[PDB]
Structure 1
Amino acid sequence: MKLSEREWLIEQDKLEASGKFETCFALTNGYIGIRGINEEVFCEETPGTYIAGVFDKSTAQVTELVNLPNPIGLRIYINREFLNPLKCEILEFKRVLDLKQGILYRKLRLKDVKGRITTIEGFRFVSMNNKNLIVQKYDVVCENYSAVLNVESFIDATTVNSKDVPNDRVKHYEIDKKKDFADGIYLGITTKDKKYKVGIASSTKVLLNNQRCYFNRFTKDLGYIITENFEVEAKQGERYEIEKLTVLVSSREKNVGDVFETCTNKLKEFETKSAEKLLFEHIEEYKRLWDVANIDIVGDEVANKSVKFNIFHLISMANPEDEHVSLGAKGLHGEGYKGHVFWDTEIFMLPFYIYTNPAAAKAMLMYRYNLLDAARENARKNGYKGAQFPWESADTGEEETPKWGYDYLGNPVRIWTGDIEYHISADIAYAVMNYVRATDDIDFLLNYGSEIIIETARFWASICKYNKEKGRYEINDVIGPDEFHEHCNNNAYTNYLAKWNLLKASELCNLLLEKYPKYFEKLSKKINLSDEEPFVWQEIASKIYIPYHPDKKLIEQFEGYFNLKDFVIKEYDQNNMPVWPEGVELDKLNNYQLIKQADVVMLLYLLGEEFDDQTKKINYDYYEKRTMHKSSLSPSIYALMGVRVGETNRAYINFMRTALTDLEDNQGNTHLGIHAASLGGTWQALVFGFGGISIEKDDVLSVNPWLPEKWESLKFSIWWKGNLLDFKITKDNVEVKKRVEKGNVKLKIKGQEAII
């Protein structure tokens, strides 16, 4: 293995425990996730070992993505004394994530108090093609000495969730078995609710010139830590090659029967290939994905690198084979938000997959399809009809939003988002149409998508409330995307999206009846559709209230938002983020016009082909200036929409706010996990903002790019109607090339229609 050039490398400065790097250096294949801890597992490190879909509640308030035993641990002892990196003089330190190859490398050259110098150089990856497999390889060289070296491998099944918060800590698993099976060591667990079993097999070997070079192997059962240990009579300057393969299998897999048998056989197979060869198979997967997803920015090396970083974590975390999971708000990179799935995925993350790997996007839509029954049950429990998707989803599709937490001031507080942040159900319907529009996947629409869109429309028809005096339908006592304002009436974003979802479902019903009558019938029989429902939906939609001041062309975020105390945003912090205005009480956010994130502007982004340029510009200007950017979701959408409305003054800096969310930790909580929505947002702002792509009413692909000052070019590729397109954007021009000649693509390049 050879490192990629610097352009592809993300570097940690200093040898130390770091929450931030544990997140940025977290490695996943969309099934296994592993936090970027150091292999020694130092004192203050937070390990993270996750398998997608493996959730457990036990004594916690809601179900949580399980922190499984930590299997990657590896220590070196010199004559039975732990070679402790933080205890040595550091002669050489390098530590990098290689985004092109998807490996985490680390090289240490250490001088201990005895003046002995040792080299430890190696890497690890979570296999993209062997989803069960983790691979670690480290060369060790005793440069000026000879000694007995103990290579210690260990699985640590003392891990817990919420390790730093005494109230919330819980161990979500019990240890079923531990075994020295000669060829390695095994530890198996069952989650405490008993819904999942996981096996972990690990096998370490120490070689010199590809022979096993250890005089003794022993194993230790230390309670809930099991170890595998190789003693080597190490001679000065010789190259001791340590390889550790670890396999994780869960009872989610078809169909395994015994995780122990499956683990250990899987490990046998992996043993017949070399570390070199598992690596090459791993790197091929990254080639295939980068070939489409890579974006080249010329003139801004910070932007270019930060964008590779965003994309890499996006391409790493999705598994199109798994139609029973989707992407948590922090990927598989940490515990913040408990591995739950929000609108972050449908609205921020999904378009990336729609346009770069449509099979991933479909799988994540199949997650929602498969939880339709839980969404129907969720509706029924709240007095509504159709499908009411939860604000926070895990494995069953029940509402997993906590009811209690702590506010900005550390006080206990009720959490209302699960209860009344309803827009999620519309967001999923929108994301369904977005996927089908892009791919022309009619099969999906007919068999799965239509049912989702119609059931969420049924939900919206149940919650809309007719106000007779006013001759309008309202949706009252909600939270819109701006979570600062709770118990609002007629959030415009919510009302509009509901209105969109209702008209979409009618339109679909009449299309399926006219054009796909056998599919219409099967849907109608499955979900009990009546002939009147399409009309009922048209009628509610025609009269849903949108708060709107025609004289000022301003869309009011929710009724009465205009009477609330205004406030000037006067300064930015070291990371160029808004700082709260003087006067503001952080538990009275409801009384001001300050907003957390894009809300009307989010609406203007999603349903933009239905508002005029003046409107978009006017509402952009009003809200952008009142936006605190207090969610990692916020800046991407203001970069993207800034461009779209000619208000490019601040487009660059919002863009760099999203792109550096975790690399500069600009929200201060990167240690909780990757800000997964902001990754998708960054990609969207380049392609739908700077790259100037927008979709028009007749599904014609319009292109009106704007590059910031520093950028001479921007290249990116998207899938559009089954055609792979290459865009090259420069200061002056736009070129679009099809990668396969054949098929017709209609574009509107700066007001001018063009065929390719």
Structure 2
Amino acid sequence: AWRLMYNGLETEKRAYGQESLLTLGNGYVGWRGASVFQSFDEHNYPGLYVAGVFNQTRTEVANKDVVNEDMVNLPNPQLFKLTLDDQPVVINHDTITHREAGVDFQNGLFTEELTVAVPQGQLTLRTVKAVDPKQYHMLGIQLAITADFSAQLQVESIIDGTLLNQNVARYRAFDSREFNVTEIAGDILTAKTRSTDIDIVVGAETTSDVMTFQNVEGPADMQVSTGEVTLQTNQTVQIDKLIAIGTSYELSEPLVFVQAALATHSVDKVIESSTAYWQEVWETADIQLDSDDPDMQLMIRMNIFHIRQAAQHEANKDLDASVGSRGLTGEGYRGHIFWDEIFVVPYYAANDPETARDILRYRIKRIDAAKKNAILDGEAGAMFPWQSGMYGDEQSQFIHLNTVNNEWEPDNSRLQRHVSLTIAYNIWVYTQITGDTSLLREGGLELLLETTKFWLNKAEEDADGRYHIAGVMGPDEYHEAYPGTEAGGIKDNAYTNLMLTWSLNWLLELAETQTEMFESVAHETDFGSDWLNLAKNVSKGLALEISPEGIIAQYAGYFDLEAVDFAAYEAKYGDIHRIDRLLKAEGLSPDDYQVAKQADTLMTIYNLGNRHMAKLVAQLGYDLPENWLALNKDYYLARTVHGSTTSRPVFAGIDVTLNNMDEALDYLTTAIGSDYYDIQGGTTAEGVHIGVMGETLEVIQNEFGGVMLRDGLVSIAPNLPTSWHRLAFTQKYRGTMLTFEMTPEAVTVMADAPLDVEVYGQPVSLAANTAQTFT
């Protein structure tokens, strides 16, 4: 219900995967749930990451230098080596007799309970790991050693600065050394990233009641403290290690900061700090669902836990960072920031708004780089990268090595230009839910005006007045180009033209409702009447391709592509969620076929809802049949293989609108339990899937739960499945708290301030602390 628990030894990617979901974090650090006794091998990967600390490596492959920006795995401060009677204690899979590890979401504490068989008996080892969310540079470890015998025990407490980035198997072909150890002085190890000039300072102190630890000279690039004690029979020995993490990216003088931090904290403080923090968090952040799924309530909180570990205002207010695709739990995609933000930003805005503002600063700070990125590709305005990191330049590869013939080929990954519209969408959602216009003033409006310049300039008017957007990719990554050409990008992706149509609407609204701010920023950005006139005509003339039946084509010419025999590919190969790689193995190109990795055209409904999207299509002068949603959903689900974890929940929310309750609960159960169950084996070995954690919470609260906040008002239209006996949670809207209790036939809502809301489309006035029930 509250504790994610594992019992028994796992191996390989299954062992890495548990480590990912057991990761503890506080916005500033991500600390992988690995055993304190192990280093990187086939069943273990210790990982420590800091928000925004990247390194660039250069690896020469095929006469070309491949530059990779890697989120740095810090020196491992948790390593412990034991010794009995000067004989080393071997802790591996052949000597561990009992193993259970887990994270208690109520207090944020990681435990690992081990029993090791040693030549003289059994060693019982229980580890508590914690992170301080207030003194967010602080970590601490509680280690308890017990033996059913007596011998001389020497404990070695190590900061291991010899490790590399080795979490992702396919990344090991590249240079994986990320820093040089510049000094080891007493409690402190200092490193400096090889190419980004970041000083990394890792300091630690190890104490106990019944032994003294002393810093000793150790192996190269390892800081070592050593203590000796005589184990009495069935007598527990308790050891505390206080760790302080600091880098020059967020601190002006990181060495002296770590020094004062070690001398002004304790493991107990960290434990109680994490304890008090989560107890306070769960007063409002919990989402209580009593249903016929016994595991469902745990994974809902697991989602809430990992999203709040990835970013929390008490730490992130001091940081220049956002939430990566894996948060801070692993090295999958090298910690880069994706458009995945769209899956967490509305959650942060609705339940913890200051953290949402913190991570939107990351994009606002990087408008300049986006403007530099637009020039580099011959574009205008601000064109945000597909993969952003330290500087905001494009960190996706431009070029890829063909594996059949050994020659370089263009890489089209960056052509998913719609990532610019997600950033703009995320500022709108935040502005709508919080009412904090100070973000728009401090870059948010400039970001919108500069990205609008990128879209408006890229647009092409035809002879009959229609505007087109070419050379782009939609969210369906399976389609990078038209059949026949090497030029990347397709034309008039429906998701892009619609999202862009929305952005011009919101821009034009801001010019009226926020005239003072608008004219100021438009003057500073040279957004004159010419640009504004272009925006108005593009908002009316963007082109879409819709068939006579009402099917909105994914992009122009999509109806001409070939069909795929999905049932044949399924029976032949098994799973088709990588049908793109199956097609390429047969010498076939996914560019030629009607198959979708994830929601593309239907992703507009996730962002805006079907009513908003229908209004946009009509605004563009197109007529849709009254049942276009079901038709388009049916059309595209039949072509979608769910190659991404974010695919199914978009269909789930649509199914709620269509009252397809069986499929809606099915797809949501599938998606929310992907990381937890891991029936395939190791899908989270490279990092937890943060986006699907926020996306499934959206299905629970905004689709099933039927709560919307982004449309200028609170809209309450719950549609619960019969198996969901009770759904309760809170929401934040412009400083007002809202509490909800929902059953399959009634909703109860209370606001701690006066609020005019809508319930099933009917206007309702809420009085402060006076709940109402709607059956």
TM over 0.5: yes
| Per-residue Cα deviation, 1:662-716 (whole angstroms, up to 9, x for no partner) | 112367531111111111111111111110123585x233233233343211112
Q: Which amino acid aligns with 1:650?
A: E
2:332 is aligned, of 318, 336, 352, to 336
Q: 2: distance between equivalents of 1:169 and 1:623?
A: 41
Aligned positions of 1:534-549 closer than 5 A: 534-549=532-547
| Per-residue Cα deviation, 1:542-566 (whole angstroms, up to 9, x for no partner) | 11101222x3111110112112222
> 1:750 and 2:760 equivalent?
yes
SS of residue paired to 2:674: coil
> 1:123 and 2:128 equivalent?
yes
Q: Which amino acid aligns with 2:477?
A: E
Structure 1 gaps, min length 5: 1-5
Conserved 8 A contact 2:216-2:226? yes
Q: 1: distance between equivalents of 2:700 and 2:576?
A: 20
Conserved 8 A contact 1:644-1:692? no
Q: Which amino acid aligns with 1:433?
A: W
Q: 1: distance between equivalents of 2:405 and 2:367?
A: 36
Q: Which residue number corresponds to residue 489 of structure 1? A: 491
Conserved 8 A contact 1:401-1:417? no
> 1:246 and 2:239 equivalent?
no
Q: Which residue number corresponds to residue 83 of structure 1? A: 89
Q: 2: distance between equivalents of 1:47 and 1:410?
A: 37
Q: 2: distance between equivalents of 1:413 and 1:664?
A: 39
SS of residue paired to 1:141: strand
Q: Which amino acid aligns with 1:324?
A: D
Conserved 8 A contact 2:545-2:552? yes
User: CA 1:34–1:582 in structure 2 vs 1: closer, same or farther (change >3 Å)?
Assistant: closer
User: CA 1:419–1:188 in structure 2 vs 1: closer, same or farther (change >3 Å)?
Assistant: same
User: CA 1:599–1:413 in structure 2 vs 1: closer, same or farther (change >3 Å)?
Assistant: farther
1:713 is aligned, of 715, 720, 726, to 726
2:500 is aligned, of 498, 501, 526, to 498
Q: Which residue number corresponds to residue 685 of structure 2? A: 671
1:141 is aligned, of 136, 142, 146, to 146
Q: 2: distance between equivalents of 1:525 and 1:479?
A: 32
Per-residue deviation, 1:218? 5.2
Structure 2 gaps, min length 5: 60-66, 481-488, 615-625, 767-775
Q: Which amino acid aligns with 1:361?
A: A
SS of residue paired to 1:333: coil
Conserved 8 A contact 1:555-1:619? yes
| Per-residue Cα deviation, 1:353-383 (whole angstroms, up to 9, x for no partner) | 0111010111111111111111111112222
User: CA 1:313–1:483 in structure 2 vs 1: closer, same or farther (change >3 Å)?
Assistant: same
Per-residue deviation, 1:75? 2.2
1:478 is aligned, of 455, 467, 472, to 472
Q: Which amino acid aligns with 1:619?
A: N
Conserved 8 A contact 2:756-2:763? no
Q: 2: distance between equivalents of 1:343 and 1:191?
A: 27
Q: Which residue number corresponds to residue 25 of structure 1? A: 22
Conserved 8 A contact 1:568-1:581? no
User: CA 1:755–1:349 in structure 2 vs 1: closer, same or farther (change >3 Å)?
Assistant: same
Q: 2: distance between equivalents of 1:288 and 1:409?
A: 56
SS of residue paired to 1:270: coil
Q: Which amino acid aligns with 1:510?
A: E
Q: Which residue number corresponds to residue 204 of structure 1? A: 206
Q: Which amino acid aligns with 1:244?
A: K
Q: 2: distance between equivalents of 1:393 and 1:732?
A: 45
User: CA 1:141–1:409 in structure 2 vs 1: closer, same or farther (change >3 Å)?
Assistant: farther
Q: Which amino acid aligns with 2:697?
A: W
Q: 1: distance between equivalents of 2:574 and 2:275?
A: 34
Greater Cα offset, 651-660 or 591-600: 651-660
Conserved 8 A contact 2:351-2:731? yes
User: CA 1:87–1:447 in structure 2 vs 1: closer, same or farther (change >3 Å)?
Assistant: closer
Q: Which amino acid aligns with 2:637?
A: E
Per-residue deviation, 1:628? 0.8
User: CA 1:700–1:568 in structure 2 vs 1: closer, same or farther (change >3 Å)?
Assistant: farther
Q: 1: distance between equivalents of 2:366 and 2:271?
A: 36
SS of residue paired to 2:92: helix
Q: 1: distance between equivalents of 2:176 and 2:448?
A: 38
Greater Cα offset, 397-406 or 72-81: 397-406
SS of residue paired to 1:86: coil
Aligned positions of 1:516-527 closer than 5 A: 517=516, 519-527=517-525
User: CA 1:122–1:204 in structure 2 vs 1: closer, same or farther (change >3 Å)?
Assistant: same
Conserved 8 A contact 2:156-2:226? yes
User: CA 1:14–1:356 in structure 2 vs 1: closer, same or farther (change >3 Å)?
Assistant: same
Q: Which residue number corresponds to residue 773 of structure 2? A: none
1:172 is aligned, of 162, 173, 178, to 178
Per-residue deviation, 1:323? 4.8
Q: 2: distance between equivalents of 1:383 and 1:194?
A: 27
Conserved 8 A contact 1:323-1:366? no
User: CA 1:681–1:631 in structure 2 vs 1: closer, same or farther (change >3 Å)?
Assistant: same
Q: 1: distance between equivalents of 2:335 and 2:264?
A: 31
Q: 2: distance between equivalents of 1:408 and 1:751?
A: 56
Per-residue deviation, 1:159? 1.4
How many pairs align?
Answer: 724
Aligned positions of 1:463-474 closer than 5 A: 463-468=458-463, 470-474=464-468
Q: Which amino acid aligns with 1:597?
A: Q
Q: 2: distance between equivalents of 1:410 and 1:33?
A: 40
Q: Structure 2 length as normaliser, TM-score?
A: 0.88
Q: Which residue number corresponds to residue 486 of structure 2? A: none
2:700 is aligned, of 665, 686, 705, to 686
Q: Which residue number corresponds to residue 397 of structure 1? A: 392
Aligned positions of 1:471-620 closer than 5 A: 471-486=465-480, 487-513=489-515, 517=516, 519-549=517-547, 551-570=548-567, 578=577, 580=579, 584-585=583-584, 588-608=589-609, 609-612=611-614, 614-620=627-633
Q: 2: distance between equivalents of 1:93 and 1:504?
A: 55
Conserved 8 A contact 2:466-2:541? yes
> 1:278 and 2:270 equivalent?
yes
Q: 1: distance between equivalents of 2:270 and 2:225?
A: 22
Q: 1: distance between equivalents of 2:269 and 2:100?
A: 24
Greater Cα offset, 295-304 or 568-577: 568-577
> 1:702 and 2:715 equivalent?
yes
Conserved 8 A contact 1:604-1:616? no
Q: 1: distance between equivalents of 2:640 and 2:405?
A: 23
User: CA 1:408–1:95 in structure 2 vs 1: closer, same or farther (change >3 Å)?
Assistant: farther
User: CA 1:715–1:87 in structure 2 vs 1: closer, same or farther (change >3 Å)?
Assistant: closer
SS of residue paired to 2:383: coil
SS of residue paired to 1:229: strand
Q: 1: distance between equivalents of 2:278 and 2:7?
A: 22
Runs in 1 of length 4+ with deviation above 6 angstroms? 406-413, 572-577
Q: 1: distance between equivalents of 2:189 and 2:571?
A: 50
Per-residue deviation, 1:64? 1.6
Q: 2: distance between equivalents of 1:733 and 1:227?
A: 62
> 1:226 and 2:200 equivalent?
no
Greater Cα offset, 320-329 or 157-166: 157-166
SS of residue paired to 2:714: strand
Q: Structure 1 length as normaliser, TM-score?
A: 0.91
Q: 2: distance between equivalents of 1:397 and 1:593?
A: 34
Q: 1: distance between equivalents of 2:414 and 2:111?
A: 45
Aligned positions of 1:361-376 closer than 5 A: 361-376=356-371
Conserved 8 A contact 2:142-2:239? yes
Q: Which amino acid aligns with 2:763?
A: E
> 1:432 and 2:444 equivalent?
no
Aligned positions of 1:313-352 closer than 5 A: 313-320=306-313, 321-345=317-341, 347-352=342-347
Q: 1: distance between equivalents of 2:591 and 2:499?
A: 23
